[PDB]
Short mmCIF file of C-alpha atoms in Angstrom, two decimals:
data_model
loop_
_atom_site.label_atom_id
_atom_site.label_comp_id
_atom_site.label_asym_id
_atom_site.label_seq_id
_atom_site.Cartn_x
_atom_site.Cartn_y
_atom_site.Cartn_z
CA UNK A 1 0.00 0.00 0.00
CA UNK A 2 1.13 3.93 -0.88
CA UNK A 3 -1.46 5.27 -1.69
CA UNK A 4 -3.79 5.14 1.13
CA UNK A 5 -0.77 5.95 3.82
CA UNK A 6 -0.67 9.30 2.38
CA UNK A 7 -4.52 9.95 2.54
CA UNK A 8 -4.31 9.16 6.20
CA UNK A 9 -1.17 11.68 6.55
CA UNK A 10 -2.71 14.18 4.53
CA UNK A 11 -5.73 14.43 6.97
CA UNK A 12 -3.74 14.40 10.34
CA UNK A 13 -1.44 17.15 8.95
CA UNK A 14 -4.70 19.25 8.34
CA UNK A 15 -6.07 18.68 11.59
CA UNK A 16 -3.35 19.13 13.89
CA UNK A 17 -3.09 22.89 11.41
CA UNK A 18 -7.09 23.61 11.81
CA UNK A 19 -6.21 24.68 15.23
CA UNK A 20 -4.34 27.87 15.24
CA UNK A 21 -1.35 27.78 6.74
CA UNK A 22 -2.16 24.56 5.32
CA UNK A 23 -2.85 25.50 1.87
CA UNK A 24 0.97 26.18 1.68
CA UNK A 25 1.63 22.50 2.63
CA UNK A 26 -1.22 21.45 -0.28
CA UNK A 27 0.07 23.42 -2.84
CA UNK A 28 3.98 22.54 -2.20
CA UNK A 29 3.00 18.94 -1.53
CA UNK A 30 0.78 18.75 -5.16
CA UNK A 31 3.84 20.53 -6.91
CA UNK A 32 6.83 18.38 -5.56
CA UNK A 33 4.34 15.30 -6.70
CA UNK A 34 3.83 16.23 -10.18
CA UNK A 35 7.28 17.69 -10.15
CA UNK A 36 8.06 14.23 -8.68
CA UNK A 37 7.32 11.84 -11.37
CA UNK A 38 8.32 14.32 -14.22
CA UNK A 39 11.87 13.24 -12.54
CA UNK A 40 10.68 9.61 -12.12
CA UNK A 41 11.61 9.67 -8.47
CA UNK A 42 9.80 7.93 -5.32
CA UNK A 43 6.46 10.13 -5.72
CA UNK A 44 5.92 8.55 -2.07
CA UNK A 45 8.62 9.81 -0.33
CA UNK A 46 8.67 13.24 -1.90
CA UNK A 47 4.73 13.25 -1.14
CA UNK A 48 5.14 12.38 2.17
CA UNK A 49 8.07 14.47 2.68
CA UNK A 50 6.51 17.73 1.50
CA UNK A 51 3.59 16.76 3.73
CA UNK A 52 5.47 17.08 7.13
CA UNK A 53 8.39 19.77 5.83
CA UNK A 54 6.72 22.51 7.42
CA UNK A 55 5.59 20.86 10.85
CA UNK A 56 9.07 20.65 12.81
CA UNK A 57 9.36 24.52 13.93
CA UNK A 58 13.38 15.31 18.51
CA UNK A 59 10.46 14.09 19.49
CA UNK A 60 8.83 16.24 16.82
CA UNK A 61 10.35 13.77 14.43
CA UNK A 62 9.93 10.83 16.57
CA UNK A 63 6.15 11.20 16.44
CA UNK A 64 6.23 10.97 12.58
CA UNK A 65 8.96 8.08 12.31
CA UNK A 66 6.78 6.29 14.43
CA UNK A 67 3.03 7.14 12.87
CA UNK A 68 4.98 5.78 9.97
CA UNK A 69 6.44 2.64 10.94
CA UNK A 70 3.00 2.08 11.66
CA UNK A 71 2.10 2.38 8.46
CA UNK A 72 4.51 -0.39 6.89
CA UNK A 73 6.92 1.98 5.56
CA UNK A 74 9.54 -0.01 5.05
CA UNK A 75 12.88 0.89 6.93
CA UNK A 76 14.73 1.73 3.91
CA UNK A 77 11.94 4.69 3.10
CA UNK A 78 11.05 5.76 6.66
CA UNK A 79 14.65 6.50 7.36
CA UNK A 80 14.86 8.17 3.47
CA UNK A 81 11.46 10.31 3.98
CA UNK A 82 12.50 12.61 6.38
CA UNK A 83 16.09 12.16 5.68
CA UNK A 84 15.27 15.28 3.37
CA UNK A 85 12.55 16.83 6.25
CA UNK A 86 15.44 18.12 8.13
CA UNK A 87 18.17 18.99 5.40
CA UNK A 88 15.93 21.41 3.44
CA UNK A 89 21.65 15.11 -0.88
CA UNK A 90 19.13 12.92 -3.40
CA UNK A 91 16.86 13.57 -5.77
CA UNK A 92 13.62 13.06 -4.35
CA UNK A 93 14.73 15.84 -1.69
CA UNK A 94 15.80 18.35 -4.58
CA UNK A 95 11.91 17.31 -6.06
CA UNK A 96 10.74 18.86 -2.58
CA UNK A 97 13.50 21.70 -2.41
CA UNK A 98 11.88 23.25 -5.31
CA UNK A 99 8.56 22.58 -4.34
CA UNK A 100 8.78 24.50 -1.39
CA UNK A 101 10.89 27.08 -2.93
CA UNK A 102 8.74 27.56 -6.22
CA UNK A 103 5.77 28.32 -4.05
CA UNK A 104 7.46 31.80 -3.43
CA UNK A 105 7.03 32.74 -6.91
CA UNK A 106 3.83 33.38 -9.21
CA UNK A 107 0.46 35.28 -8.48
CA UNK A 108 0.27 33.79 -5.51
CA UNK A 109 4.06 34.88 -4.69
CA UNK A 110 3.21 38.31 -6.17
CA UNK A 111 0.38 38.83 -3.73
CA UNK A 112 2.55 37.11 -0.41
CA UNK A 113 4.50 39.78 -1.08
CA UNK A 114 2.33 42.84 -1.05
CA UNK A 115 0.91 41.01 1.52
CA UNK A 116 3.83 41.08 4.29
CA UNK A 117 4.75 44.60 2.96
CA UNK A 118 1.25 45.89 4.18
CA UNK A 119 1.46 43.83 7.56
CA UNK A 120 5.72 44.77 7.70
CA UNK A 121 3.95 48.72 7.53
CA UNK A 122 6.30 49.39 4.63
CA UNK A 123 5.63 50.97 1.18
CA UNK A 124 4.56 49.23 -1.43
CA UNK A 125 7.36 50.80 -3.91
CA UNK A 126 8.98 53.50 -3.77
CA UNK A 127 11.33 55.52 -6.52
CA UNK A 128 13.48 57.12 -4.83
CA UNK A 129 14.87 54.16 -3.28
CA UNK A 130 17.88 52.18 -4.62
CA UNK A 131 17.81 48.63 -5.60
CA UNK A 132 20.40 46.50 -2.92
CA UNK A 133 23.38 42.67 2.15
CA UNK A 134 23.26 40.58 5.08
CA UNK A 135 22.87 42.04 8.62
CA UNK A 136 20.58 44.99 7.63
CA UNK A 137 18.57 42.91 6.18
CA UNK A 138 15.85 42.74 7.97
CA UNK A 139 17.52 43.88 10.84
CA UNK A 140 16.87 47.66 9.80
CA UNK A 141 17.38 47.96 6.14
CA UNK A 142 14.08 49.57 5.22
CA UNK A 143 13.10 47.74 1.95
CA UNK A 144 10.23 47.81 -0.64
CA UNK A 145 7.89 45.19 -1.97
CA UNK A 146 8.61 45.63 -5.36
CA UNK A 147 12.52 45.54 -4.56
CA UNK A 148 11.73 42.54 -2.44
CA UNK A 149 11.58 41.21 -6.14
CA UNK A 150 14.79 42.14 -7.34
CA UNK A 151 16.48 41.14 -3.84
CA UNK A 152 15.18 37.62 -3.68
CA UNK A 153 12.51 36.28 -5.30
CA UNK A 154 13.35 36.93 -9.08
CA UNK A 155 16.55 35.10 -7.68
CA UNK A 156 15.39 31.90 -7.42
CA UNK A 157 15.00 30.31 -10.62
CA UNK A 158 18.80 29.57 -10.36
CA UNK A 159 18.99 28.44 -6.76
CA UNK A 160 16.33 25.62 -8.65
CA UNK A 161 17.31 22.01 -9.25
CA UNK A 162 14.88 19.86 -10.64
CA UNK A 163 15.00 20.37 -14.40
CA UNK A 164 11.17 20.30 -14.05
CA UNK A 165 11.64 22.80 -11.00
CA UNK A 166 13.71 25.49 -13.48
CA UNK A 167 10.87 24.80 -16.21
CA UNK A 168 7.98 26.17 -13.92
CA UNK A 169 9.79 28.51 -11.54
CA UNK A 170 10.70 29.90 -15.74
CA UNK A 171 7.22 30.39 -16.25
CA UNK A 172 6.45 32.03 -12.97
CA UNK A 173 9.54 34.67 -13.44
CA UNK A 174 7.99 36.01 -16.34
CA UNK A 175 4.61 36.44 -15.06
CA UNK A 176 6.14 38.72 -12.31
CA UNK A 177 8.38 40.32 -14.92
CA UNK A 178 5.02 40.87 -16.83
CA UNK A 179 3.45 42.39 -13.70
CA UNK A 180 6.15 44.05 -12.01
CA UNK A 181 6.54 45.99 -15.54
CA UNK A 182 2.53 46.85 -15.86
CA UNK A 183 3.36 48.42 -12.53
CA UNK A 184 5.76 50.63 -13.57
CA UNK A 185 4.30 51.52 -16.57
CA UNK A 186 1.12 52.57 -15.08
CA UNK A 187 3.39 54.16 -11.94
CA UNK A 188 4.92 56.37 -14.49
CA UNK A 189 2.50 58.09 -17.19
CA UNK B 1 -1.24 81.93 -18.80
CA UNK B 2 -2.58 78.80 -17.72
CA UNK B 3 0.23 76.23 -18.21
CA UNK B 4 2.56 77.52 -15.82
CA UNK B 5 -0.27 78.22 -13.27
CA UNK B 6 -0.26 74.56 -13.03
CA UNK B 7 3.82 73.61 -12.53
CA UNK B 8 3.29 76.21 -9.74
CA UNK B 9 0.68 74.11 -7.85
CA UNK B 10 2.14 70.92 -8.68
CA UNK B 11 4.81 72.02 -6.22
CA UNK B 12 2.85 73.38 -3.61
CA UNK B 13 0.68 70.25 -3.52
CA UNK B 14 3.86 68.21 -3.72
CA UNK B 15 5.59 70.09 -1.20
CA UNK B 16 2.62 70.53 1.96
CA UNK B 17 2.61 66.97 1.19
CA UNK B 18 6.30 65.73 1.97
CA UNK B 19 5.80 66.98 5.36
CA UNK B 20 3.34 63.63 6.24
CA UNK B 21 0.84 59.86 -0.47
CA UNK B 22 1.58 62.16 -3.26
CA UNK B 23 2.07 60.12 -5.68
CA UNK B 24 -1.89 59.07 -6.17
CA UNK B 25 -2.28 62.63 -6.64
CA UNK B 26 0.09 62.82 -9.31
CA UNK B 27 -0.94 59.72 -11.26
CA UNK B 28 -4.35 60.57 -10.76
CA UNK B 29 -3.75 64.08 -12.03
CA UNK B 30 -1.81 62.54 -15.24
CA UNK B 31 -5.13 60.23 -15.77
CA UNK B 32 -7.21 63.05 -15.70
CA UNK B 33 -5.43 65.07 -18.25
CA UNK B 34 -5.03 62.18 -21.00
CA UNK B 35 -8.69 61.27 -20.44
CA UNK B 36 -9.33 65.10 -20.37
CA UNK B 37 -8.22 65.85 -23.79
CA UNK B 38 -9.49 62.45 -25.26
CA UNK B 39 -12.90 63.95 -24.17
CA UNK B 40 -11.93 67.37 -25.32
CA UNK B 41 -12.48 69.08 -22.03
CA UNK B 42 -11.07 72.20 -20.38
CA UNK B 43 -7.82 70.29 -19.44
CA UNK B 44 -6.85 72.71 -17.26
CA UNK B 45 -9.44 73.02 -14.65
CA UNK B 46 -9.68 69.25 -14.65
CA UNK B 47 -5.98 68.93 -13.83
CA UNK B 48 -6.11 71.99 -10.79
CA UNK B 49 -8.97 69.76 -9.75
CA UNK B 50 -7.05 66.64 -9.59
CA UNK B 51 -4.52 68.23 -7.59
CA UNK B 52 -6.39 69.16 -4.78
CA UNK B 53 -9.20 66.69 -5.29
CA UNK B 54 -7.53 64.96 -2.17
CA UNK B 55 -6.12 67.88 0.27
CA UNK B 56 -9.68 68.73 2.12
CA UNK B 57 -9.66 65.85 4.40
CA UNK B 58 -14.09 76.09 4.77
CA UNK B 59 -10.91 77.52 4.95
CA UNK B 60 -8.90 74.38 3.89
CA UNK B 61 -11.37 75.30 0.16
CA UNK B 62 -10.62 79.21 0.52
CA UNK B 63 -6.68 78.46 0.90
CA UNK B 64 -7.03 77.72 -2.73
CA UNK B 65 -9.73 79.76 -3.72
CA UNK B 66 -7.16 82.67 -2.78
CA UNK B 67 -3.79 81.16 -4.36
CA UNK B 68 -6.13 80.51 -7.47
CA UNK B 69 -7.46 84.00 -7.56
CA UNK B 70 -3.45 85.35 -7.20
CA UNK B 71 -3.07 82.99 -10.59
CA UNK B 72 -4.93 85.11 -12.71
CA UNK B 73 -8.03 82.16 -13.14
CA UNK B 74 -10.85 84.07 -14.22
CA UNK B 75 -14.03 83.63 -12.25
CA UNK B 76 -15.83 80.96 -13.94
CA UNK B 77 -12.93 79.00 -14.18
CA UNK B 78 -11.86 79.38 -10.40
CA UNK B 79 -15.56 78.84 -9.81
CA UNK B 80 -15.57 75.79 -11.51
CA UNK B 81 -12.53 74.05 -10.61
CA UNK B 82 -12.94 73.27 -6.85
CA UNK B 83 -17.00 73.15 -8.41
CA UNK B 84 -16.21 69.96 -8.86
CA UNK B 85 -13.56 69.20 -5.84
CA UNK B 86 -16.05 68.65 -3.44
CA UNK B 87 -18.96 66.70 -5.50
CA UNK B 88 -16.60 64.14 -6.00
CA UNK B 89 -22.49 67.96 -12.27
CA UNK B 90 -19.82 68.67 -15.57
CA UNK B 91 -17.87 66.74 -18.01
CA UNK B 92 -14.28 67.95 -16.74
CA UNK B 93 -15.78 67.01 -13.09
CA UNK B 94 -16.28 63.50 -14.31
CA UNK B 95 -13.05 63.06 -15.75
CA UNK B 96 -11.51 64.21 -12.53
CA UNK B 97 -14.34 61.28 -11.28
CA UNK B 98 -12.79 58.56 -13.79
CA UNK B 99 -9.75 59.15 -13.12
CA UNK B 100 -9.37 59.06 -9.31
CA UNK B 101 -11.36 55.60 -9.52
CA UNK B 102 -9.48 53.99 -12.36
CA UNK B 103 -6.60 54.01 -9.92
CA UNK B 104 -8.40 51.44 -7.64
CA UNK B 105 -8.27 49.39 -10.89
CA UNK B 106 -4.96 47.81 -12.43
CA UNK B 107 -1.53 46.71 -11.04
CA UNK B 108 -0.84 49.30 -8.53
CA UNK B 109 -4.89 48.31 -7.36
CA UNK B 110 -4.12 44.57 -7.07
CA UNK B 111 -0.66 45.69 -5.27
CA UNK B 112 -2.36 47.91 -2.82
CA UNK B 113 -5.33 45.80 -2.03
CA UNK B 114 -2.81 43.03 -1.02
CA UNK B 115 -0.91 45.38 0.70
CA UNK B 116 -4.01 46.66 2.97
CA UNK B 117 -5.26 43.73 3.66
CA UNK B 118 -1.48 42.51 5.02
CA UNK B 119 -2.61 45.82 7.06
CA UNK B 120 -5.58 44.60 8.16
CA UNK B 121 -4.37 41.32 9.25
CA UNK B 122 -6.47 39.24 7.46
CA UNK B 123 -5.88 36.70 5.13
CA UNK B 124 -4.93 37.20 1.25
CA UNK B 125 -7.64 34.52 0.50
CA UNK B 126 -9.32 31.84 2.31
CA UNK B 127 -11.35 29.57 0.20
CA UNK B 128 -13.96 28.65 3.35
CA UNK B 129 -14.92 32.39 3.39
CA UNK B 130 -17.43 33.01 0.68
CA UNK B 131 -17.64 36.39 -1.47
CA UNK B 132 -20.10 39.05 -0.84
CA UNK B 133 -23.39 44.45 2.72
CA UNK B 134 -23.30 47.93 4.50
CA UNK B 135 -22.78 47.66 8.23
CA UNK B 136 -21.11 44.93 8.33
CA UNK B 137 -18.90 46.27 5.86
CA UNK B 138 -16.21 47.06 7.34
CA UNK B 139 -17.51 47.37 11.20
CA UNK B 140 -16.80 43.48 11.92
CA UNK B 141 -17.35 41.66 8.06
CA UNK B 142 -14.53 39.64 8.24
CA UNK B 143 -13.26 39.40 4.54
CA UNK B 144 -10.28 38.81 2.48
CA UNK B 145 -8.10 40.60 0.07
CA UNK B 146 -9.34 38.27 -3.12
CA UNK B 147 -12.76 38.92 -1.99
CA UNK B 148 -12.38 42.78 -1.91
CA UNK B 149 -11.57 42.35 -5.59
CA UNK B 150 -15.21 40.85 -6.12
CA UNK B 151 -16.79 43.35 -3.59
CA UNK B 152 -15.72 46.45 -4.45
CA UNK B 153 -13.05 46.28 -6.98
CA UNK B 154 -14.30 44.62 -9.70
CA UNK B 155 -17.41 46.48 -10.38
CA UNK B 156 -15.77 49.59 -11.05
CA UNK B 157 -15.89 49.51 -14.78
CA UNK B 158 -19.17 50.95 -14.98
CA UNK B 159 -19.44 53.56 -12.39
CA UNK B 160 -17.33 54.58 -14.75
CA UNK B 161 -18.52 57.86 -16.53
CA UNK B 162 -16.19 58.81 -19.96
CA UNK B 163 -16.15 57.03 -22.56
CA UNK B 164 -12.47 56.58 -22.33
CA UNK B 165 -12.96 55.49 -19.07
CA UNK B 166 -14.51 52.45 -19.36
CA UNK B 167 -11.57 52.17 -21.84
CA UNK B 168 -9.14 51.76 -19.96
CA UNK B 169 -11.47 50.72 -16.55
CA UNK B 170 -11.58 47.64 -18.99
CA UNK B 171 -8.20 46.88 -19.42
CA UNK B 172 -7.40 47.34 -16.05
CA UNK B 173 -10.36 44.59 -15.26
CA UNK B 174 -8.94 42.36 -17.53
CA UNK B 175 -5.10 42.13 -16.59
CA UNK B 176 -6.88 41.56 -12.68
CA UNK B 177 -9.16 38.72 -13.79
CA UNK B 178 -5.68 37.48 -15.58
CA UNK B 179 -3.99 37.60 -12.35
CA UNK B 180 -7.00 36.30 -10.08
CA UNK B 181 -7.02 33.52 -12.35
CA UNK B 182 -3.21 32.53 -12.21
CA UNK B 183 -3.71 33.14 -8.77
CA UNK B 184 -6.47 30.44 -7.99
CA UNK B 185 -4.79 27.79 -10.43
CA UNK B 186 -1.42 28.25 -8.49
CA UNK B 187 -3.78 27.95 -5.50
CA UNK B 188 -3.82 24.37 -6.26
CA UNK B 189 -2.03 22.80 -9.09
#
């Protein structure tokens, strides 16, 4: 069985988060899957994996290495599944590197971003400031959204690995080039 | 003259204002004046008007009113400028109308929503909270920012008034159904 000890997993890891966020852990999961067998890797592992990524932040671990052996995973997997959790090596892990990471790009990236601007209390762009670093960071370095794009995100399509992963987080660069230019352009006159 | 009247308050406007923004003011001016011509308006009085459309919020009106009069603008111009500053009647008035609405609309509209809501502190989107009202508006009606775009945002276009408006009130609605689109299919896969 594989199939079915994921549809248990995917429930408990939406309870235990219906009590505070999830959709995060849906939408990487569903990526690093298709992503997954695009590499022909272990779609279980990487599944699973990108399933419990995000729940960690000992016997944190423990709990799922042992929900797990309960489930039949063989030793071999179970001690390969979260052998990526924690180091986020093999291929299945760089499946759910990007995963994770490609979720910070796109529409939904776009609007994260103006998102934690408004809540940060920042501006949303601003002109007059220059375009970037290490300990002002976010330690005082006073930042924009929009440069928030040229600082990190539209640097990520490198940091991919997955030739699948480059392929997608390609197609998700340009959509922010395409709306981070009909900004400006309707910014300006 | 006329034209310089204008570079004369779009530094006094600019200046009483970098002592806090601005920028809405001045796009929203520039709108006004492209849609002003296309409708073959007094381009003028619509672009004073745009100016200080915003700064009111009695002697804030007379401040002006005075300045104005030092400009030379004859009566039934000076009369009909801020005529239309606080119905916000006449054409030029509802250019100066278009114009400060089709800024909800567009990029810089799906930017600031996002940003505002991240404000809020509410959620960019939650698919268990369905779409939508006057009390509850904004006095406890929990909502999110993707929501906002089918409350408020979205039916824009035809409160519109010039023709031109809905123009350009329609490409604006487009590229936003483009990216609430792109949005929801990133959403899940």
């Amino acid at each position: 069985n594989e199939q079915a000890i994921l549809q248990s997993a995917e429930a408990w890891v939406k309870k235990q988060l219906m009590d505070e966020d999830w959709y995060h852990i849906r939408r990487v999961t569903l990526m690093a899957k298709a992503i997954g067998e695009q590499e022909k890797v272990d779609v279980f592992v990487v599944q699973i994996a990108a399933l419990f990524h995000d729940l960690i932040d000992e016997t944190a671990k423990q709990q799922l290495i042992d929900w797990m052996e309960a489930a039949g995973v063989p030793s071999q997997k179970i001690d390969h599944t979260m052998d990526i959790i924690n180091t986020i090596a093999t291929r299945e892990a760089m499946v759910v590197q990007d995963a994770d990471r490609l979720d910070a790009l796109g529409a939904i990236g776009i609007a994260r971003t103006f998102a934690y601007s408004g809540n940060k209390g920042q501006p949303i762009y601003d002109p007059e400031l220059p375009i970037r670093m290490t300990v002002e960071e976010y330690r005082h370095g006073k930042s924009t959204a929009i440069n928030h794009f040229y600082e990190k995100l539209f640097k990520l399509k490198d940091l991919m690995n997955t030739e699948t992963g480059k392929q997608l987080a390609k197609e998700r660069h340009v959509f922010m080039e395409q709306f981070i230019e009909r900004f400006l352009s309707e910014w300006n006159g």
